[PDB]
């Protein structure tokens, strides 16, 4: 069901947030701390925004949730060097996310 799928999405989001590597993605990026972010990234997304959307019932499917998670990971890849701490963190998050999404297909 929509409800059971979204329950599991909420769990994935919590589990991502529980990782040490989630630190860059917890809150929206502030371009006053991070130079050029607004110029480079057209569509910002972060875990707090996803959590608020879940709480308000703004996702009507697990696919809508997935689109936001992917935006987080894609923005990270786009903006940061792959060998940077934040670059590495995004790769960790994406790998973990896919490892949990797999449960839909077991």
């Amino acid at each position: 069901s929509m409800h059971s799928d979204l329950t599991f999405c909420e769990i994935i989001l919590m589990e991502m947030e529980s990782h040490d590597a989630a630190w860059p993605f917890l809150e929206p990026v502030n371009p006053r701390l991070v130079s050029g972010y607004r110029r480079i990234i057209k569509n910002p997304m972060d875990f707090s925004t996803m959590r608020e959307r879940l709480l308000r019932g703004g996702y009507t499917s697990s696919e809508e949730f997935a689109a936001d998670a992917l935006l987080v990971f894609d923005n990270c890849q786009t903006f940061n060097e792959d060998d940077s701490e934040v670059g590495k963190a995004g790769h960790i998050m994406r790998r973990f996310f896919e490892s949990r999404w797999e449960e839909f297909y077991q």
């Binding site: 701390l33 480079i40 903006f79």
Partner: peptide
């Protein structure tokens, strides 16, 4: 070190 954009950007 601080978060920053790829040098090429």
């Amino acid at each position: 070190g601080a978060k920053r954009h790829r040098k090429v950007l």
